[PDB]
Every structure is written in C-alpha cells, then in structure tokens.
Short mmCIF file of N, CA and C in Angstrom, two decimals:
data_model
loop_
_atom_site.label_atom_id
_atom_site.label_comp_id
_atom_site.label_asym_id
_atom_site.label_seq_id
_atom_site.Cartn_x
_atom_site.Cartn_y
_atom_site.Cartn_z
N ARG A 10 -24.69 -41.98 15.66
CA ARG A 10 -23.29 -41.81 15.26
C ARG A 10 -22.85 -40.36 15.41
N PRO A 11 -21.61 -40.09 15.82
CA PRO A 11 -21.13 -38.71 15.86
C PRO A 11 -21.03 -38.14 14.45
N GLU A 12 -21.54 -36.94 14.19
CA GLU A 12 -21.56 -36.38 12.84
C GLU A 12 -20.18 -35.90 12.40
N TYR A 13 -19.80 -36.21 11.17
CA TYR A 13 -18.56 -35.76 10.56
C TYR A 13 -18.78 -34.37 9.95
N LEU A 14 -18.25 -33.33 10.59
CA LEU A 14 -18.58 -31.94 10.27
C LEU A 14 -17.82 -31.40 9.06
N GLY A 15 -16.59 -31.83 8.87
CA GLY A 15 -15.77 -31.42 7.74
C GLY A 15 -14.33 -31.86 7.88
N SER A 16 -13.51 -31.55 6.90
CA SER A 16 -12.09 -31.86 6.93
C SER A 16 -11.27 -30.92 6.07
N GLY A 17 -9.98 -30.88 6.35
CA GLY A 17 -8.97 -30.22 5.55
C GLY A 17 -7.72 -31.06 5.44
N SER A 18 -6.90 -30.80 4.44
CA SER A 18 -5.61 -31.45 4.31
C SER A 18 -4.58 -30.58 3.61
N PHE A 19 -3.32 -30.86 3.87
CA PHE A 19 -2.17 -30.11 3.41
C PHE A 19 -1.06 -31.09 3.00
N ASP A 20 -0.30 -30.78 1.96
CA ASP A 20 0.97 -31.46 1.74
C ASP A 20 1.97 -31.05 2.80
N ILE A 21 2.78 -31.98 3.30
CA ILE A 21 4.07 -31.64 3.86
C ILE A 21 5.04 -31.54 2.68
N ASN A 22 5.35 -30.32 2.28
CA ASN A 22 6.30 -30.04 1.23
C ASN A 22 7.71 -30.30 1.75
N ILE A 23 8.46 -31.18 1.08
CA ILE A 23 9.87 -31.45 1.36
C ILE A 23 10.71 -30.65 0.36
N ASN A 24 11.49 -29.70 0.85
CA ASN A 24 12.26 -28.77 0.03
C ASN A 24 13.75 -29.10 0.11
N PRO A 25 14.44 -29.34 -1.01
CA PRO A 25 15.88 -29.54 -1.06
C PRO A 25 16.68 -28.36 -0.50
N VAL A 26 17.81 -28.65 0.13
CA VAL A 26 18.77 -27.66 0.64
C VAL A 26 20.17 -28.04 0.17
N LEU A 27 20.88 -27.13 -0.49
CA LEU A 27 22.25 -27.36 -0.92
C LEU A 27 23.25 -27.14 0.20
N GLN A 28 24.21 -28.04 0.34
CA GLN A 28 25.42 -27.81 1.12
C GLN A 28 26.37 -26.87 0.36
N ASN A 29 26.49 -25.62 0.80
CA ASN A 29 27.48 -24.67 0.31
C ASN A 29 28.81 -24.71 1.07
N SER A 30 28.86 -25.32 2.24
CA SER A 30 30.12 -25.62 2.92
C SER A 30 30.96 -26.62 2.11
N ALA A 31 32.27 -26.51 2.21
CA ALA A 31 33.23 -27.33 1.49
C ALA A 31 33.05 -28.84 1.70
N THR A 32 33.67 -29.64 0.83
CA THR A 32 33.69 -31.10 0.97
C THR A 32 34.31 -31.53 2.30
N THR A 33 33.75 -32.59 2.88
CA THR A 33 34.15 -33.21 4.14
C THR A 33 34.07 -34.73 3.98
N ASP A 34 34.62 -35.49 4.93
CA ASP A 34 34.38 -36.94 4.99
C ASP A 34 32.89 -37.26 5.24
N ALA A 35 32.17 -36.39 5.94
CA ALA A 35 30.74 -36.54 6.19
C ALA A 35 29.89 -36.40 4.92
N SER A 36 30.09 -35.32 4.16
CA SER A 36 29.32 -34.99 2.96
C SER A 36 30.05 -34.00 2.04
N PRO A 37 29.95 -34.19 0.71
CA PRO A 37 30.63 -33.38 -0.28
C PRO A 37 29.94 -32.03 -0.50
N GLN A 38 30.65 -31.02 -1.00
CA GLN A 38 30.00 -29.79 -1.44
C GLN A 38 29.01 -30.12 -2.55
N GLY A 39 27.85 -29.48 -2.52
CA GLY A 39 26.76 -29.77 -3.45
C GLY A 39 25.86 -30.92 -3.01
N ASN A 40 26.13 -31.57 -1.88
CA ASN A 40 25.21 -32.52 -1.28
C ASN A 40 23.85 -31.87 -1.02
N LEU A 41 22.80 -32.66 -1.05
CA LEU A 41 21.43 -32.18 -1.07
C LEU A 41 20.64 -32.73 0.12
N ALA A 42 20.59 -31.96 1.19
CA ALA A 42 19.74 -32.18 2.35
C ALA A 42 18.29 -31.71 2.08
N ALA A 43 17.44 -31.66 3.09
CA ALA A 43 16.08 -31.13 2.97
C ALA A 43 15.56 -30.46 4.24
N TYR A 44 14.45 -29.74 4.15
CA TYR A 44 13.58 -29.41 5.28
C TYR A 44 12.12 -29.60 4.88
N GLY A 45 11.26 -29.88 5.85
CA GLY A 45 9.85 -30.16 5.59
C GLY A 45 8.94 -29.19 6.30
N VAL A 46 7.95 -28.67 5.60
CA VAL A 46 6.98 -27.73 6.15
C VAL A 46 5.62 -27.92 5.52
N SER A 47 4.58 -27.60 6.26
CA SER A 47 3.20 -27.79 5.85
C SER A 47 2.33 -26.73 6.47
N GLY A 48 1.22 -26.38 5.84
CA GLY A 48 0.32 -25.38 6.39
C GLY A 48 -0.59 -24.74 5.38
N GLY A 49 -1.40 -23.81 5.86
CA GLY A 49 -2.40 -23.10 5.08
C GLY A 49 -3.59 -22.71 5.93
N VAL A 50 -4.67 -22.28 5.29
CA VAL A 50 -5.96 -21.97 5.92
C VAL A 50 -7.05 -22.88 5.37
N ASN A 51 -7.86 -23.47 6.24
CA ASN A 51 -8.74 -24.58 5.87
C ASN A 51 -10.17 -24.21 5.41
N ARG A 52 -10.82 -23.21 6.03
CA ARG A 52 -12.30 -23.07 6.05
C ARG A 52 -12.98 -24.38 6.50
N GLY A 53 -12.71 -24.79 7.73
CA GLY A 53 -12.98 -26.13 8.26
C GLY A 53 -14.43 -26.58 8.16
N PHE A 54 -15.34 -25.92 8.86
CA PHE A 54 -16.76 -26.22 8.79
C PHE A 54 -17.63 -25.02 9.18
N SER A 55 -18.91 -25.08 8.83
CA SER A 55 -19.96 -24.26 9.42
C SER A 55 -21.11 -25.16 9.85
N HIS A 56 -21.61 -25.03 11.08
CA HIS A 56 -22.63 -25.93 11.61
C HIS A 56 -23.44 -25.28 12.73
N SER A 57 -24.68 -25.72 12.93
CA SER A 57 -25.53 -25.29 14.04
C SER A 57 -26.00 -26.48 14.87
N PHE A 58 -25.96 -26.36 16.19
CA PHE A 58 -26.10 -27.48 17.11
C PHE A 58 -27.48 -27.50 17.75
N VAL A 59 -28.23 -28.59 17.62
CA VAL A 59 -29.59 -28.70 18.18
C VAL A 59 -29.64 -29.21 19.61
N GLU A 60 -28.50 -29.63 20.16
CA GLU A 60 -28.35 -30.23 21.48
C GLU A 60 -26.90 -30.07 21.96
N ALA B 8 -8.47 -0.46 23.14
CA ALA B 8 -8.64 0.99 23.04
C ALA B 8 -9.93 1.52 23.70
N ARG B 9 -10.87 0.63 24.02
CA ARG B 9 -12.11 0.89 24.77
C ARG B 9 -11.87 0.82 26.29
N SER B 10 -12.93 0.97 27.10
CA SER B 10 -12.92 0.88 28.57
C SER B 10 -12.72 -0.56 29.08
N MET B 11 -11.50 -0.91 29.48
CA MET B 11 -11.13 -2.26 29.94
C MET B 11 -11.64 -2.58 31.34
N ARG B 12 -11.83 -3.86 31.66
CA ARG B 12 -12.17 -4.29 33.03
C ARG B 12 -10.98 -4.17 33.98
N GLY B 13 -11.24 -3.83 35.23
CA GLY B 13 -10.20 -3.58 36.24
C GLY B 13 -9.59 -2.19 36.15
N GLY B 14 -10.23 -1.24 35.48
CA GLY B 14 -9.68 0.10 35.22
C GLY B 14 -8.63 0.11 34.11
N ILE B 15 -8.10 1.28 33.78
CA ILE B 15 -7.11 1.39 32.71
C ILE B 15 -5.73 0.88 33.14
N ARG B 16 -5.15 0.00 32.34
CA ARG B 16 -3.70 -0.15 32.24
C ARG B 16 -3.36 -0.44 30.79
N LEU B 17 -2.41 0.29 30.23
CA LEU B 17 -2.16 0.24 28.80
C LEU B 17 -1.68 -1.16 28.39
N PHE C 10 9.88 -21.45 2.92
CA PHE C 10 9.62 -21.59 4.36
C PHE C 10 8.14 -21.45 4.64
N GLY C 11 7.67 -21.93 5.79
CA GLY C 11 6.28 -21.78 6.20
C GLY C 11 5.88 -20.34 6.56
N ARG C 12 4.57 -20.10 6.64
CA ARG C 12 3.94 -18.85 7.11
C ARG C 12 3.44 -19.00 8.54
N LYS C 13 3.73 -18.03 9.41
CA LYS C 13 3.30 -18.02 10.82
C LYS C 13 1.78 -18.05 10.98
N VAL C 14 1.27 -18.69 12.03
CA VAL C 14 -0.15 -18.65 12.39
C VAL C 14 -0.46 -17.46 13.31
N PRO C 15 -1.70 -16.96 13.35
CA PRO C 15 -2.06 -15.84 14.21
C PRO C 15 -2.00 -16.17 15.71
N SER C 16 -1.97 -15.16 16.57
CA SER C 16 -2.22 -15.32 18.01
C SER C 16 -3.66 -14.94 18.36
N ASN C 17 -4.22 -15.46 19.45
CA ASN C 17 -5.57 -15.09 19.89
C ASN C 17 -5.63 -13.79 20.71
N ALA C 18 -4.51 -13.09 20.90
CA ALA C 18 -4.40 -11.96 21.82
C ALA C 18 -5.47 -10.87 21.61
N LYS C 19 -5.87 -10.59 20.37
CA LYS C 19 -6.91 -9.59 20.07
C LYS C 19 -8.30 -10.05 20.49
N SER C 20 -8.68 -11.31 20.28
CA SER C 20 -10.00 -11.76 20.72
C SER C 20 -10.07 -11.82 22.25
N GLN C 21 -8.99 -12.24 22.91
CA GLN C 21 -8.92 -12.22 24.37
C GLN C 21 -9.03 -10.80 24.92
N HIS C 22 -8.36 -9.82 24.32
CA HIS C 22 -8.52 -8.42 24.69
C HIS C 22 -9.98 -7.98 24.54
N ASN C 23 -10.63 -8.26 23.41
CA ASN C 23 -12.03 -7.87 23.20
C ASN C 23 -12.99 -8.44 24.25
N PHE C 24 -12.80 -9.67 24.73
CA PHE C 24 -13.68 -10.24 25.76
C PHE C 24 -13.60 -9.50 27.11
N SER C 25 -12.54 -8.74 27.34
CA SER C 25 -12.27 -8.02 28.58
C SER C 25 -12.81 -6.59 28.60
N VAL C 26 -13.38 -6.10 27.50
CA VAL C 26 -13.94 -4.75 27.42
C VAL C 26 -15.32 -4.74 28.07
N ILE C 27 -15.49 -3.98 29.15
CA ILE C 27 -16.79 -3.84 29.81
C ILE C 27 -17.77 -3.03 28.94
N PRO C 28 -19.08 -3.31 28.97
CA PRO C 28 -20.05 -2.53 28.25
C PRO C 28 -20.19 -1.14 28.85
N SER C 29 -20.61 -0.17 28.05
CA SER C 29 -20.91 1.18 28.53
C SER C 29 -22.14 1.18 29.44
N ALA C 30 -22.15 2.02 30.47
CA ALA C 30 -23.30 2.19 31.35
C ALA C 30 -24.45 2.88 30.61
N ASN C 31 -25.68 2.43 30.82
CA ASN C 31 -26.87 3.08 30.29
C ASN C 31 -27.42 4.07 31.33
N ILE C 32 -27.43 5.36 31.00
CA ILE C 32 -27.45 6.43 32.01
C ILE C 32 -28.84 6.93 32.39
N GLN C 33 -29.81 6.88 31.48
CA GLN C 33 -31.17 7.41 31.72
C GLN C 33 -31.18 8.93 32.02
N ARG C 34 -30.57 9.72 31.15
CA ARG C 34 -30.63 11.19 31.22
C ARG C 34 -32.06 11.71 31.05
N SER C 35 -32.38 12.87 31.61
CA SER C 35 -33.65 13.56 31.38
C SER C 35 -33.50 15.07 31.48
N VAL C 36 -34.42 15.83 30.88
CA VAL C 36 -34.44 17.30 30.92
C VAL C 36 -35.58 17.81 31.79
N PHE C 37 -35.31 18.75 32.69
CA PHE C 37 -36.33 19.38 33.52
C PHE C 37 -35.94 20.78 33.95
N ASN C 38 -36.91 21.56 34.39
CA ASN C 38 -36.68 22.91 34.86
C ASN C 38 -36.43 22.92 36.37
N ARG C 39 -35.33 23.52 36.81
CA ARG C 39 -34.89 23.60 38.21
C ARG C 39 -34.92 25.05 38.70
N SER C 40 -36.00 25.75 38.40
CA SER C 40 -36.21 27.13 38.83
C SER C 40 -36.15 27.31 40.34
N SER C 41 -35.60 28.42 40.81
CA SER C 41 -35.53 28.78 42.23
C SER C 41 -35.54 30.28 42.46
N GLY C 42 -36.20 30.77 43.50
CA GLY C 42 -36.13 32.17 43.94
C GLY C 42 -35.18 32.37 45.12
N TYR C 43 -34.57 33.54 45.23
CA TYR C 43 -33.68 33.92 46.32
C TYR C 43 -33.87 35.40 46.64
N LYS C 44 -34.03 35.77 47.91
CA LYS C 44 -34.31 37.15 48.34
C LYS C 44 -33.34 37.54 49.42
N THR C 45 -32.81 38.76 49.37
CA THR C 45 -31.74 39.16 50.29
C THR C 45 -31.58 40.66 50.43
N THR C 46 -30.82 41.09 51.43
CA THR C 46 -30.36 42.47 51.57
C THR C 46 -28.85 42.52 51.63
N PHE C 47 -28.23 43.47 50.94
CA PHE C 47 -26.78 43.61 50.92
C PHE C 47 -26.33 45.05 50.72
N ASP C 48 -25.05 45.30 50.97
CA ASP C 48 -24.37 46.58 50.85
C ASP C 48 -23.33 46.56 49.73
N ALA C 49 -23.00 47.71 49.16
CA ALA C 49 -22.07 47.82 48.05
C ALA C 49 -20.63 47.36 48.37
N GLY C 50 -19.90 46.95 47.34
CA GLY C 50 -18.52 46.50 47.40
C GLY C 50 -18.28 45.05 47.82
N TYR C 51 -19.18 44.39 48.53
CA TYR C 51 -19.03 42.98 48.88
C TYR C 51 -19.36 42.04 47.72
N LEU C 52 -18.69 40.89 47.67
CA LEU C 52 -19.04 39.77 46.81
C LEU C 52 -20.05 38.90 47.55
N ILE C 53 -21.30 38.91 47.14
CA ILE C 53 -22.39 38.18 47.78
C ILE C 53 -22.69 36.90 47.01
N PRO C 54 -22.59 35.70 47.60
CA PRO C 54 -22.94 34.47 46.90
C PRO C 54 -24.46 34.25 46.86
N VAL C 55 -25.11 34.68 45.79
CA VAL C 55 -26.58 34.63 45.66
C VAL C 55 -27.10 33.33 45.07
N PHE C 56 -26.27 32.63 44.33
CA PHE C 56 -26.62 31.38 43.68
C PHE C 56 -25.58 30.35 44.05
N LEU C 57 -26.04 29.17 44.43
CA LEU C 57 -25.19 28.02 44.70
C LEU C 57 -25.92 26.77 44.23
N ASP C 58 -25.25 25.91 43.48
CA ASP C 58 -25.81 24.62 43.10
C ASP C 58 -24.72 23.57 42.87
#
C-alpha cells in the first residue's frame, strides 16, 4: 500500500461584508455580503525513503 | 551575492 | 484578508551559485643570480619576473 505520510487542514473562513452604498432595487444599505479565504502553514511531514 | 553561473549579471 | 505565500526565487538563485575553485597554493624559494656590466645614468632592468 502507498504510505500515508501526513496531512493538514484549514477552515475556509467566510467573512461578512457590509454594503455601505445606498439602498437600491438590487440590495438595501446595510445588506450583508461575504468573502471567503483560507490558509496557513502546515508542517506537512518529515520522512526518509528506502527506495 | 556570491559568484553566479554564466558570469556576473546583477 | 488572507496572508500571501512565499516565492521560490531565493532557493532558485542559490542553486545557480557555482562553488569556489580549490587552488592548491604552495610556498617555495625562487632564488636567482644575475651578472652584468653597466655605465652611470642609465636605467638598467636587472630583475624581471
């Protein structure tokens, strides 16, 4: 079997964004959109290969 | 900052 | 907002640095004699190396 060397994981943080532009037929002032971002540093694995 | 291959070019 | 990831540009630069030459210096005596006749006022080249 292929060896499982390690893993990492991150949240995709979804952050609210306020509409500061005036009210429209599309969306009112104070409407709440979002943007999504994820990341970090893992320390993934350390390993030595015999073949 | 050391001696590069192909001579110096900054 | 997110944080930017690094570029590999520094490790790629480091792989391109040639090693220094290993020179094999040594110390020795390079003695020599020189014999001549000359007249006053001239610049005589008695030693050349």
